């Protein structure tokens, strides 16, 4: 958390390009005098989003054999444009703050558990992220009364069934294929 | 994107 | 900020 990590990410160019936006350069330095090329946006449904490894605020250090640590904005764009159909990126990022994993036991009310979910493979709630997210908690429902679950929580598992890289419909099935008492594994920021 | 009730 | 689509 807060420390630098370095990663090789190879992307295959799709019809709409690599599927991300950049800012920075020696002539457009955002944040102090740091000339780094940064990712500012991951395009929904694009190559970077489907791959899932590239993150907003990652700094691109190399594009294939080209050093983009101290280049103009235009030089970076050109290097990415000319990089071919298989693009090998070497990036740097500050590790995000760690998430708290929590177990929550809920008893269903007459209207279920009282929350809504979004996300899944092909329905990413955040571009690049296949996780199931809580998007709504029903006033007066079981999740609300318990008080632990919150909007923006990630559902990792329901009872013994993992929800890592699953389709949205399977996440719903798993959450509805339950008895009255449900055990949830949850990731909080 | 989808949103479902649980 | 200058931003380019890649
Ligand atoms: N671990 C290998 C590779 C790491 C890597 O790919 N990143 C940097 C080296 S610090 C690079 O020059 N990448 C350009 C490339 O893909 O050849 C090494 O010792 O260089």
Cα–Cα distance between A10 and A68 in angstroms, integer?
A: 16
Q: Give the count of beta carbons closer than 10 Å to the beta carbon of residue A76.
A: 25
Tokens representing A120 are 């899944």
Tokens representing A93 are 């990022």
Tell which residue, A40, A58, A68, has the closest CA to residue A94. A58
The technique is X-ray
Q: Looking at ligand 1, which residue's alpha carbon is closest to its atom 3? A: A8
In this structure, which topology does domain A93-189 adopt according to CATH?
Pdz3 Domain (2.30.42)
Cα–Cα distance between A143 and A137 in angstroms, integer?
A: 7
Tokens representing A106 are 């809920």
Q: Which value in Å is the resolution of this experimental model?
A: 2.1
Q: Looking at ligand 1, which residue's alpha carbon is closest to its atom 14? A: A65
DSSP letters, chain A, are --SEEEEEEEEE-BTTBSSEEEEE-SSS--STT---EEEEEE-TTSHHHHH----TTPEEEEETTEE-TT--HHHHHHHHHTS-SEEEEEEEEEPPPPPEEEEEEEE-BTTBT-EEEEE-TTS-SBTTB--EEEEEE-TTSHHHHH----TT-EEEEETTEE-TT--HHHHHHHHHS--SEEEEEEEE-
- Identify all chain A residues contacting C4, using CB atoms and an 8 Å cutoff: 21-23, 73, 77
- In the reported structure, the alpha carbon of residue A60 is separated from the centroid of ligand 1 by a whole-number distance in angstroms of 12
- Tell me the pairing of strands A4-12 and A86-94: antiparallel
Positions of CATH 2.30.42.10 in chain A: 93-189
- In the reported structure, the alpha carbon of residue A68 is separated from the centroid of ligand 1 by a whole-number distance in angstroms of 13
**Does ligand 1 have an atom closer than 6 angstroms to the CB of A157?**
no
Closest CA of chain A from C1, distance in Å: 7
């Amino acid at each position: 958390e807060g420390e630098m990590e370095y990663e090789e990410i190879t992307l295959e160019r799709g019809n709409s390009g690599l599927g991300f936006s950049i800012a920075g350069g020696t002539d457009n330095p955002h944040i102090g005098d740091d000339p780094s090329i940064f990712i500012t946006k991951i395009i929904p449904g694009g190559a970077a989003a489907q791959d899932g490894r590239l993150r907003v605020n990652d700094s691109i250090l190399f594009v294939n054999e080209v050093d983009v640590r101290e280049v103009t904005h235009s030089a970076a764009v050109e290097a990415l444009k000319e990089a071919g159909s298989i693009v090998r990126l070497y990036v740097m990022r500050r590790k995000p703050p760690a998430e708290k994993v929590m177990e929550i036991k809920l008893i269903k009310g007459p209207k279920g558990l009282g929350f809504s979910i979004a996300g899944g493979v092909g329905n990413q709630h955040i571009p690049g992220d296949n996780s199931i997210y809580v998007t709504k908690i029903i006033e007066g429902g079981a999740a609300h009364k318990d008080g632990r679950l919150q909007i923006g929580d990630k559902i990792l598992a329901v009872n013994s069934v993992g929800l890592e890289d699953v389709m949205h419909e399977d996440a719903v099935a798993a959450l509805k294929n339950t008895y009255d008492v449900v055990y949830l594994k949850v990731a909080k920021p | 994107r989808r949103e479902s009730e649980i």
